[PDB]
Write a protein that binds this ligand. Structure first.
Ligand SMILES: *[C@@H]1O[C@H](CO)[C@@H](O[C@@H]2O[C@H](CO)[C@@H](O[C@@H]3O[C@H](CO)[C@@H](O)[C@H](O)[C@H]3NC(C)=O)[C@H](O)[C@H]2NC(C)=O)[C@H](O)[C@H]1NC(C)=O
Length: 138
């Protein structure tokens, strides 16, 4: 957890349950988000699915995924064949591709999700990521 940070994005995770999950990372580190994953023996009704978004602080604060940001990943395979669906975020300064994001050191970024079956629409799981300043990373 000094290059790759594992984040299990589901409501049974106490860190998300508490509603203030936050992590510090260094440029070039990776954030690996693991979508909810279940055994076939699971009741659907109890299968979590989410869309994950990156928003600004106000959107993060208000669980607003409609006003501004980007849809980043879709946790839509609760029974994915080889382990949970996993999305990776690399905190890099430059990206040569258009499907990517570039980060700046000494800045915080925000992520929130909306339930896919769209339930109780109001509260949300969320995550704050602070990219430490260059140097404050040894
Ligand atoms: C909801 O979030 C939970 C909170 O973490 C998930 O539980 C964690 O599952 C992890 C993966 O199965 C376990 O971590 C380790 O992951 C590495 C990476 O592949 C494995 O090698 C390890 O074997 C595995 N176990 C360890 C730590 O050695 C965690 O142990 C486990 N943590 C907790 C808090 O129980 C749930 O899976 C997730 N639930 C749903 C519905 O997806």
């Amino acid at each position: 957890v000094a290059d790759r940070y594992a984040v299990y994005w589901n409501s049974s995770n106490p860190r998300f349950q508490r509603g203030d999950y936050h992590i510090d990372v260094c440029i070039n580190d990776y954030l690996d988000v693991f979508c909810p994953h279940y055994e076939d023996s699971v009741p659907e009704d109890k299968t979590e699915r989410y869309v994950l978004y990156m928003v600004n602080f106000d959107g993060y604060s208000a669980c607003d995924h409609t006003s501004k940001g980007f849809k980043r990943w879709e946790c839509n395979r609760p029974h994915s064949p080889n382990g949970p669906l996993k999305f990776s975020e690399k905190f890099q300064l430059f990206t040569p591709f258009s499907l990517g994001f570039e980060f700046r050191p000494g800045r915080e970024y925000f992520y929130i999700s909306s339930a896919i079956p769209d339930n109780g629409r109001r509260s949300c799981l969320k995550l704050k990521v602070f990219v430490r300043p260059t140097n404050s990373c040894m």
